[PDB]
Design a protein around this ligand. Structure first.
Ligand SMILES: N[C@@H](Cc1cc(I)c(Oc2cc(I)c(O)c(I)c2)c(I)c1)C(=O)O
Ligand SMILES: N[C@@H](Cc1cc(I)c(Oc2cc(I)c(O)c(I)c2)c(I)c1)C(=O)O
Lengths: 120, 120, 120, 120
């Protein structure tokens, strides 16, 4: 695809894009600590665009945190999970473009990853 | 563990097994069409064991229909699917044990097959 | 300009779009029988477009059938289901645009819908 | 029945329980840190029963972490996610039962919570 790191969030109760979800991305440092990498909020389409350029998105372990609790909390639903979280290693083989899709439900959530090579 | 076929249904919105969901089993005939094989409704545990006996369950194509629409209509929710349907070929490679599991949400559902192998 | 019905299919084992998944759509008729509506195959993006147009896609019960067995059998994988079927009611509340997403795995498949308005 | 906390994992590629999957439960401590709580690996049934007891399992925010990466590698399969974490608040509505389920695939995973009522 185009964006190096793309996050898409869906709402399985209303069958619509989960708009305004707090997304935070962190990067593991040499000593094992968690350093804030980037963050945003999903738009009307349930997508988050512009987290990182390929230059900035270097090889390493990443952590994407979606604040699922606030989403449900705003609608008057009390969810189970405090947050949804996806931890993964990136560009260890070579530079790839990732899409992290997540489907939300008060007591459940499933997450998938689409890895696509930018070059031939 | 005794009955070769079991249906386990869960509700993703409330964090609980889905109770009294209509489950109808259809088996494909030789002339081409389908014919009623069994029926029942999920219990308190969200399970439905005791459909058929290891003897009446012969090899062939099957169809497990779950009336998901009624289930949500009862909670004030207008779901998306008319029903969840699972079609598969059973016991082509000798006798087995299949537990089909469904995860329900108004606008989405995940179905899963679990095959057990009784020591013959 | 965007078409009413869309199908997006991902592969969970490989983490990429499912290319060449055979797709068949049906429409329920007055008799309570099924009539051939459309058909196609997912492109490289794992998507399917031009299944139909706004004028042809009226109110009614539809059945999108996905040939998921051939897909796996082609890769050397022996799946469980013969195909993944999605039955739903369209253009209930007047005109709408639909998106059927299906996530594939050998013994499991998760399908979700995203209903959106063309003007809202 | 007498297990306050339960974890069940399934493999979506082989269609059977995820055996020998390492589980580690943490509990947010008084000073805000994560303290070890329970550890174990999925039995043949892909589940853990001896996790904790109705008395040791008190109120608080727990963290369940499944080591999926190691599960997949020991099969020759290189997975996407580093691991699967599930963080939740427990016993906020009295002393009830908790079942955490997970459906694993190389590039995707689903989780759901089933919260029962012991004496109901
Ligand atoms: N007597 C059985 C009943 C039961 C069977 C299954 I199989 C199961 O597992 C899942 C996990 C996920 I994640 C799903 O999406 C689905 I559908 C089913 C669960 I929980 C409970 C027991 O308690 O073991
Ligand atoms: N970009 C286009 C096409 C597209 C639609 C969806 I909807 C989507 O999201 C999911 C999320 C999960 I979780 C799945 O299992 C599956 I399959 C698809 C993705 I990625 C891409 C659009 O915006 O319509």
């Amino acid at each position: 695809s185009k964006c190096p790191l793309m996050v898409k969030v869906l709402d399985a109760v209303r069958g619509s894009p989960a708009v305004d979800v707090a997304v935070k991305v962190f990067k593991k440092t040499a000593d094992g600590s968690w350093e804030p990498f980037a963050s945003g909020k999903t738009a009307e389409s349930g997508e988050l665009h512009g987290l990182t350029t390929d230059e900035k998105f270097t090889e390493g372990v990443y952590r994407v945190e979606l604040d699922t609790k606030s989403y449900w909390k705003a609608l008057g639903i009390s969810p189970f999970h405090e947050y949804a979280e996806v931890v993964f290693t990136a560009n260890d083989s070579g530079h790839r473009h990732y899409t992290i899709a997540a489907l939300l439900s008060p007591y459940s959530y499933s997450t998938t990853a689409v890895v696509s090579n930018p070059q031939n």
